[PDB]
Symmetry: C2
Subunit: 154 residues, 2 copies
């Protein structure tokens, strides 16, 4: 499989189905304790469908408008692990080669289909080349997830 | 957007590009302390490409064979949060309507493109309708991630 060709083909299909292609641009500055960054992306139907396919998570609460409307949520919600997948994208943009070591999140409020999710991170710890980062994910001013990740940076 | 039509279209494209469509079938039995379950799925190039598109995580270490071969990994690795996305799919299959509340994972060994990842879960805690589940993810006999999730079940 030629990955670069596959990605290019899928990018075209994704964009036609309403997906937002996020350019992969590294953040700037010296990484250190207190370093802050932010990253945001809209999560639309296509993102939810693709997440369901690749994970196998076809939970009706994320897909079936009528089913979800009868639940305590009163409508569909995006997978929590799709929301937090944006944190992977955010830390991947830090200077250097970044590898995820740990993640821990609590989901605080649902994300609805079409919502823009904003990740805000701050480096709270640096031990050798392992960076501990406090993270909150938002839709507008509302916290939708909060937690901590640790990454290795080469 | 008609989600059921979009999903169906994307399922066709996904399957043609090498993706494994996992049927969504609920697990059986009474949920309780000590309840065990398992779920597995292959993660191929298409899964990685789709995860990159929907998250915006286009980290070269997951995509560029030559770049990744020069790193300490000695070749591409699947996104850690793609590996653990299978845990969402696994808990979504528990009896009832399942909502993720918390997740925490440490990544222990890389997952390579094409690897089958197996999630093994066991309910360690039940408080009202909140279930705490110890989880390990494997490729063959090798632990690739370990942690805990909490879900709400209606």
């Amino acid at each position: 499989v030629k990955m670069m060709s596959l990605l290019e083909e899928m990018k075209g299909i994704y964009s036609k189905k309403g997906g937002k292609v996020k350019p992969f641009e590294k953040f700037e500055g010296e990484l250190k304790e207190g370093y802050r960054f932010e990253y945001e992306k809209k999560l639309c139907e296509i993102d939810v469908a693709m997440f369901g396919l690749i994970s196998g998570d076809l939970n009706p609460v994320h897909f079936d408008e009528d089913f979800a409307s009868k639940t305590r949520f009163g409508g569909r919600v995006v997978h929590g692990m799709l929301t937090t997948s944006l944190v992977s994208a955010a830390v991947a943009r830090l200077p250097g080669t970044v590898v995820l070591l740990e993640q821990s999140f609590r989901y605080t409020s649902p994300v609805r289909i079409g919502d823009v999710v904003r990740v805000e991170g701050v480096v709270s710890g640096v031990e050798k080349n392992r960076y501990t980062i406090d993270v909150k994910c938002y839709t507008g001013d509302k916290v939708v997830a909060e937690g901590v990740v640790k990454v290795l940076i080469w």
